[PDB]
């Protein structure tokens, strides 16, 4: 499409102008000597707006991909972030939101485009830095990019997502988020990242207050949690629980936040995702700790798990049966025949 080529050319030309400015701009001069390019003066927002709107259609995305659109839009977002930093300027915030939305659409279902954007490590660093923006709407857009990039990440993309500090940045972002729709995007990205490798799990667990926060996302008894929050927080917990099971300090954080009690409540949920997540978490936590095994026995876990072993869903069937096996292999003294007497 020639309008699309026309728009991408405009964006590329602006970026080039910005790079040439960055390379010529000398320290300690007047504001007037070598003026910064202003995207308003180059009609950039309306260009990226049109491309964002077009990016919702798969045929328009195909045309964009043939003309290098992902790279052009990414370079634009990056250069604006580098030039202007964490600004509250409405034009800049809007530009960044539209660019990020386009990048979300262009990385959806497209393994090649995910790999390409991850390879742009300078852009990736700029994206991660925007999670500290005062705009929770920009936070949501950035988290949505990172969510898509972390879904079906290839070996190199996983390494890069880790390298640029996306896990710590997202977890720290989560602790301060007030808007549910922003939190949903942030937790969905973390759910993907938490599955990539053990080091990502450790990085989540290492953020001060993060485990208590995550257990907080599980509760029904909340004026802020929605179903989506419970699902995604529980998914993160399921993934990181393989590590937590081996760390007494982290188990203690879970204990003191009533995690086992809440997971047993989750077994009774009508939500398949919630039950699934709880079965995987209990699989892990029911191993190798007598204190937690006894609490589970006291609260009736054995029967609650037995009821789920015939599920058609692998995670429920396997996780419930495995947690049950762990409890049956480690019967507390007070439930042994010789002690009930």
């Amino acid at each position: 499409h020639h309008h699309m080529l026309h728009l991408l050319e405009q964006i590329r030309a602006y970026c080039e102008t910005c790079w040439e400015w960055q390379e010529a701009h000398e320290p300690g001069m007047d504001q007037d000597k070598n003026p910064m390019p202003a995207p308003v003066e180059h009609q950039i927002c309306p260009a990226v707006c049109v491309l964002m709107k077009l990016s919702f259609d798969e045929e328009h995305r195909h045309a964009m991909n043939e003309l290098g659109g992902l790279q052009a839009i990414a370079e634009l977002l990056q250069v604006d972030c580098e030039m202007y930093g964490l600004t509250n300027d409405h034009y800049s915030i809007t530009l960044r939101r539209y660019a990020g939305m386009a990048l979300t659409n262009l990385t959806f279902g497209d393994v090649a485009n995910k790999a390409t954007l991850c390879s742009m490590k300078g852009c990736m660093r700029a994206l991660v830095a925007q999670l500290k923006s005062e705009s929770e709407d920009l936070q949501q857009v950035i988290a949505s990019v990172l969510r898509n990039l972390s879904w079906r990440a290839d070996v190199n993309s996983k390494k890069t997502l880790r390298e640029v500090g996306s896990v710590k940045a997202l977890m720290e972002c989560a602790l301060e988020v007030k808007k549910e729709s922003t939190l949903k995007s942030v937790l969905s990205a973390l759910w993907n990242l938490s599955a990539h490798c053990t080091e990502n799990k450790a990085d989540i667990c290492a953020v001060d207050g993060a485990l208590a926060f995550l257990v907080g996302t599980l509760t029904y008894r909340s004026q802020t949690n929605t179903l989506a929050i419970i699902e995604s927080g529980g998914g993160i917990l399921r993934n990181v629980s393989s590590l937590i099971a081996t760390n007494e300090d982290h188990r203690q954080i879970l204990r003191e936040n009533n995690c086992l009690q809440t997971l047993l409540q989750h077994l009774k949920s009508h939500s398949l995702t919630i039950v699934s997540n709880a079965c995987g978490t209990l699989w892990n936590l029911s191993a190798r700790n007598p204190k937690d095994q006894e609490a589970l026995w006291d609260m009736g876990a054995v029967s609650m798990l037995k009821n789920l072993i015939h599920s058609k869903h692998k995670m429920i069937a396997m996780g419930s049966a495995a947690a049950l096996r762990n409890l049956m292999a480690n019967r507390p003294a007070k439930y042994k025949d010789a002690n009930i007497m």
């Binding site: 990016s55 990385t107 959806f108 857009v141 969510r147 898509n148 879904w151 990205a189």
Partner: peptide, 7 residues
């Protein structure tokens, strides 16, 4: 956590 279009 899956993937999604923008909004």
């Amino acid at each position: 956590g899956g993937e999604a279009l923008a909004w």
